[PDB]
Amino acid sequence: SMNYFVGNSLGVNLTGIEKAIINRLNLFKEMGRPAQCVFLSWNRYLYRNAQNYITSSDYINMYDFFQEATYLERNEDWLSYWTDECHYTLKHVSHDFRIYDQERFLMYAHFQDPKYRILDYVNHFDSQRRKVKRDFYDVRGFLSCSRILVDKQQTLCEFFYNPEGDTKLEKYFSYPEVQKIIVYYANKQYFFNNETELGAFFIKQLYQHGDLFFSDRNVYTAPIFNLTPESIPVVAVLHSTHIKNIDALDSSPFKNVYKAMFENLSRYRAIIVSTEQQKLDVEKRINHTIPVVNIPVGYSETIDTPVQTLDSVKLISVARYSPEKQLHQQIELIKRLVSYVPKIELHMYGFGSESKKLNELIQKYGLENHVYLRGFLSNLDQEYSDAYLSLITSNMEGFSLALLESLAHGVPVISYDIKYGPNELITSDFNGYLITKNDEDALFDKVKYVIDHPEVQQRLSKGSLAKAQQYSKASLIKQWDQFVRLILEHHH
Amino acid sequence: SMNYFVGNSLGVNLTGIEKAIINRLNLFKEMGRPAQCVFLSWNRYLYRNAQNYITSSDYINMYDFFQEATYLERNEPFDWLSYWTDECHYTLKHVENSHDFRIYDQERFLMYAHFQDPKYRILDYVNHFDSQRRKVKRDFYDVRGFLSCSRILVDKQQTLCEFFYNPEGDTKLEKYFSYKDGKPEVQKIIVYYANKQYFFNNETELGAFFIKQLYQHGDLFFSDRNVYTAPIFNLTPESIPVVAVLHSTHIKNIDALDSSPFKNVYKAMFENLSRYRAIIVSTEQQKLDVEKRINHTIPVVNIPVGYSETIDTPVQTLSVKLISVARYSPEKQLHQQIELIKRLVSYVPKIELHMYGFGSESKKLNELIQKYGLENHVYLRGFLSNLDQEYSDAYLSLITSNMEGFSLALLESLAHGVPVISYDIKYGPNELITSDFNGYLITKNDEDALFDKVKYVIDHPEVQQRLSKGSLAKAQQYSKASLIKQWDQFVRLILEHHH
């Protein structure tokens, strides 16, 4: 029996949902439940993005599936084919080419690498130089889709191929949205009006009695699941706040990405959220129509670096440089503290729009020896060892993997008491303090208190380690194990 | 070594060129030289049209060739209807007054199917529709059973591109179209051949590629549909020998031998004469004209386009029955034959004129017959495929045309012993008529001389008998065996010179 985690794709830079899905996959393998990520969009680069995270046997993409290119890995010279075997002439432009048959312009080629061992696309031209067809190659090397062009380079139809070149899907467009999909599957032909219907057909082919689906990218996956039979069990996963305005719990509309789910609640066996605090809110809002269960979206890995080698007082913030994170407040906090703590430092690890504003605010206060915008760091392990405490000054949060990591490194945290995440991970006077939202005077008081009393910081450090031990991998595994078993048990 | 007779296709009703190519194939087969008809146009009925006349191994069609369907015959019958209902679970709604079906998946309209036969055994096409009932694709089926071509539509069912498949469904050719003067015109052709891709701008270049794939040293090509085949051969190397075959007068204006432009259909051949090893024409008379016109730059040879079978049927069982075997078209001037009977009936009222053929002029000829009171004397017999019983009591054939070509019909009536009086017009009458031997040649449009000569033969049955015997003897010069000998000698000499 398989557990399927249904998102949409994998970007160059993984998103929160994409990381959550791969993480949940790893957890399931570890505990001995089979699991696979399920992807939907056509993405001829998907194998390239999966590479550093997940193996090809750990995912099924919908187009791969019908193109008979699932579980397929990279193929092992185009320029030697076009010259030595085909006798064409190539005039470089980029990593591009014009392919001529003697004097005749035939094709425009585009590669990725300067080794020109990975073909991207090839445009075809008629006798009047009209672009008639574009051939799109998969990073694994096979020809994946040819697009037929009309009028002012408008998409008329597209043909999708298996690696041997057989046509497996056809799409027909009017102005450009799909009006028709043809699929060659199981030795016959299937017809669909749109990609949502194609999605539901895919889900029905995947399912065998006993499997469980999770709906993770709900703006795409809920409409698909809404067209599949109720005998196919699926759980909805919310990775963010469920309503547009968190202060109108009862009346706020559901977020657009969650509408199709919440408007068909009876289709879902349960809803998963990351925090008890969110579970209680969602339960109330939906009048307990279906179960809601809190399962953390990550766990505390075992520590492999030195911990709490203190000496400079190092404050840290691990947060995207975004408005909601209200990072200027921490710069203000440092402006106040530095007169009491001359060797204080604040390191802020993240990225986003607020970079310029924040850096200029540092220049304005002369705090360039005290506050550092560190940018994004892949590995933060070395940064926590001398970290005295973490700061959260956000107006809104989600379950923080970063917070769990720093708590695992013994770094206590002072945070505003906003939904969702801090209440889950912080018990005041245990592993840190929760501060009234936007109360910057109380923030200053607690931060200064922990700095003034290193024995308080040490004790809050021991609480941090204990808080992290509560969210261990094994505790997380056991929550998922019992959830899946109980969901399936009730379905059948 | 193979001889290839390159025409375009075969219709349900064979044209003169198509007949000439099949006749030539049968002579080469009897002779023992390998021969094959070569066809160019995409025609998914071609196997059906060919079945009455040649075998599958007797021809190579260009599209069949690249579709890996050359020499393929008819598949076992397939009941698409049971496939669509029992296996696919579709709903089939018959269209009344048709062999058609609308095909549904529940409430969703998917497909419109057209069958050739009312037994629904020959699927012809299936149209596909999108969610807005737009017709986006047409699947065209070969009569042999396989899906031959899918046509992609745009806008108001205009042809954008076409994909051609082998019988297993692999794409072997692609064609892209742009419109001109309201019609689709090829702008690009892609061909999957020899594990490669080949690119062309038009059907002439594809044809030229196809000729090059067929040729091996020793082979010989005949260009029979020169409006298409000469532009093809002009794109092939002079190492490939080709003979141009003319099937009609070579110039627009027969009365300006030296200076008339060539007919449009022959223009590409005559403008590249050095490409061709020889020209074949049907009559000695045309040979002399063409030789003179091209200043003997390449050999010109006359070989008749068909042959005569000796007749076992009753012959000349002689009412005075005049006959005309002629399409009802203005060039034949059949109204003059009405005028002849109008004059003649006074002198023998037992006369009859039977006119075998069809065409636009039939109304006008009926009017004249009624006008002259000739309804019991002149008959428009329509088309008759077999004429053999009609020849047995025929006194005399008439030709009043202002232009002609070599006539297999006249050859057949001479084999049945029917003598002939004809205007002396090019081409054909001088080939098949020797004055006072099997008939008479009359100055063109001299109706009075026509009257006098016809009356003379009616008045002298012993002359009719003499001319009838000359007709038998004349026809026997065009025997199967004489034609074979001509073809054998020609091919021998052409190959020797080329090599």
Residue numbers in the entry:
A (entry chain B): 0 to 75, 78 to 94, 97 to 178, 183 to 318, 321 to 501
B (entry chain A): 0 to 317, 321 to 501
Task: Pull text from the paper.
The subsequent addition of GlcNAc to the glycoproteins is catalyzed by the second enzyme, SdgA, yielding glycosylated SDR proteins in which each SD repeat is decorated with GlcNAc disaccharide moieties.
This study reports the crystal structures of SdgB and SdgA from S. aureus as well as multiple structures of SdgB in complex with its substrates (for example UDP, N-acetylglucosamine or SDR peptides), products (glycosylated SDR peptides) or phosphate ions. SdgB undergoes dynamic changes in its structure such as a transition from an open to a closed conformation upon ligand binding and takes diverse forms, both as a homodimer and as a heterodimer with SdgA.
